[PDB]
């Protein structure tokens, strides 16, 4: 029941949002039942995958509903994620005020750039919509091209990136930074996120820039300053915002393969991001290296990591891969699509990133249903979701040890 409320709560939000888009006031053109369910699920379980363009399908009221689902879905999980961390509506109001304040000021900054181009009415809703979407790591865009026209605009790149970096790292990291303000006094988790994000983004930015430099489709016909912006944006968006500045369908396969790992590890723990978190990847990576070097314990940042943390990190990783493997297996049988797109779609759906290469619009009815399940499970979390619908019986009997060769 403690983890079952979140699973039921998101289910109620999706169906309420799905039927809210059925009215002949949200969408100009008729929308199928599966697309509305997919759109509501992507907005609630904040992923960003779209089978229909937001601008050309929904009206101002419809886009407001999408904005509401993103804010409710992003904040609903974020508040519960913080509560789960501290346990394992006084606090909700504090997070709501913080989220609204940072999104409001970001919209005002974005308004300086958008309202001179789209107008007072169009430019203010677009700035607010992108401020809400970016902070909650959604990736939804009103424009038909997802931020592809603002590849070289510093105002769009800097403000939006700051939103899903601040909202990507956990709220514990944000609290610890402002409470302590000294790196020596930060917690171990806070030091893992701050150091890990800088290292991971730098490696990702270098990889995208080098591989896509000679690609004519993306990063090739751009100025040297614009190449840096696009490489910087495409390195931080896979985890987990899923905003675009280049066409992922025209990228090199090597960049896509590296993006698969980039969007499977996600970001911060108690935040709007999803996917094995960054700390989980670091804990596993350092634990294995310590074993290879013969170290009896995993030591990082002058601290120690206990076995229950190690096994939990390894348990969520293998469980996540098994779910992704099932999704790829299910989609290959159902969808007659190239394998690389299917793999990219499944990792993006599970990590709630929303990046795609020409596959989400062309999914079949059965294919969309699989993605919705993958998005829902990935957002909730493989460990949290199972506990909701699994019989629990604490064992009290030990057994003799057995020798198993795992070489």
């Amino acid at each position: 029941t403690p983890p079952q409320v979140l699973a039921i709560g998101f289910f109620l939000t999706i169906i309420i949002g799905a039927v809210l888009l059925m009215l002949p006031i949200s969408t100009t053109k008729p929308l199928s039942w599966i697309d509305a369910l997919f759109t509501a699920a992507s907005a609630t379980t904040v992923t960003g995958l779209a089978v229909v363009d937001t601008g050309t399908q929904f009206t101002v009221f419809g886009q407001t509903v999408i904005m509401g689902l993103i804010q409710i879905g992003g904040l609903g999980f974020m508040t519960f994620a913080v509560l789960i961390v501290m346990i394992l509506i006084g606090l909700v109001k504090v997070l709501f005020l913080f989220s609204i304040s940072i999104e409001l000021i970001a919209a005002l900054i974005l308004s300086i750039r958008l309202v001179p181009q789209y107008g007072w009415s169009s430019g203010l809703f677009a700035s607010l919509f992108h401020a809400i979407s970016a902070f909650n790591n959604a990736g939804f865009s009103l424009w038909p091209d997802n931020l592809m026209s603002y590849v070289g605009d510093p105002t769009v790149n800097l403000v939006i990136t700051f939103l899903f970096i601040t909202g990507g790292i956990g709220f514990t990291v944000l609290f610890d930074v402002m409470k302590n303000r000294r790196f020596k006094t930060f917690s171990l988790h806070t030091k893992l996120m701050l150091t890990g994000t800088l290292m991971l983004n730098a490696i990702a930015m270098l990889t995208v820039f080098i591989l896509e430099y000679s690609n004519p489709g993306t990063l090739g016909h751009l100025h040297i300053v614009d190449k840096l912006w696009a490489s910087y944006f495409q390195a931080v968006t896979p985890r987990t915002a899923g905003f675009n500045s280049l066409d992922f369908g025209s990228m090199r396969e090597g960049t896509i393969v590296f993006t698969l790992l980039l969007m499977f590890i996600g970001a911060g723990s108690a935040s709007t991001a999803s996917g094995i978190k960054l700390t989980t990847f670091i804990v596993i990576l350092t634990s294995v290296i310590a074993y290879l070097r013969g170290k009896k314990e995993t030591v990082i940042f002058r601290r120690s990591i206990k076995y229950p943390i190690i096994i939990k990190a390894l348990a969520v990783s293998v469980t996540s891969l098994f779910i992704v493997f099932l999704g790829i297996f299910a989609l290959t049988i159902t969808e007659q699509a190239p394998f690389l797109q299917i793999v990219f779609e499944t990792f993006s759906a599970f990590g709630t990133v929303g990046l795609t290469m020409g596959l989400t619009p062309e999914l079949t009815t059965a294919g969309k249903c699989i993605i919705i399940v993958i998005m829902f499970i990935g957002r909730i979390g493989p460990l949290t979701f199972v506990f909701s619908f699994a019989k629990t019986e604490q064992s009290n009997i030990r057994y003799p040890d057995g020798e198993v060769f795992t070489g």
Partner: protein, 133 residues
């Protein structure tokens, strides 16, 4: 065929090994993990459990076993408490190993079907062997 031995020590371990040789299904339960690992191969089922807890006894399925042998030594309270719990589980035959005369009296009055005194009982049959020799 259906036997359970509680306490894998010098006396309890000898029963499991001898019964296993004769081809009988024996359940071995002991708190110490080293004892259970040592006798894991000498028993059909080896369990690391505490016999003084009634919740663990039901998990093992002691009520199924017709014969239960309580061979707990050096801990008289555990031996006395275990046999008292077994009578609540309506075990037909309970064989208990006694430590001294006072422990023998307590086990007799709490409903032990057969009380074993390995040091004293061996003397009365060694002496019998001397007369027959």
């Amino acid at each position: 065929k259906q036997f359970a031995v509680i306490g894998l020590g010098r006396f309890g371990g000898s029963i499991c090994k001898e019964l296993h040789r004769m081809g009988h299904e024996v359940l071995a339960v002991d708190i110490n993990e080293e004892k259970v690992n040592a006798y894991a191969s000498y028993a059909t089922h080896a369990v690391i459990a505490n016999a003084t807890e009634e919740n663990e006894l039901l998990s093992l399925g002691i009520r199924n076993f017709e014969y239960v042998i309580v061979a707990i030594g050096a801990n008289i309270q555990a031996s006395t408490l275990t046999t008292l719990l077994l009578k609540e589980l309506d075990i037909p035959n309970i064989w208990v190993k006694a430590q001294n005369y006072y422990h023998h009296k307590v086990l007799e009055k709490i409903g032990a079907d057969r009380i074993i005194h390995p040091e004293k009982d061996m003397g009365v049959k060694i002496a019998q062997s001397l007369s027959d020799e």
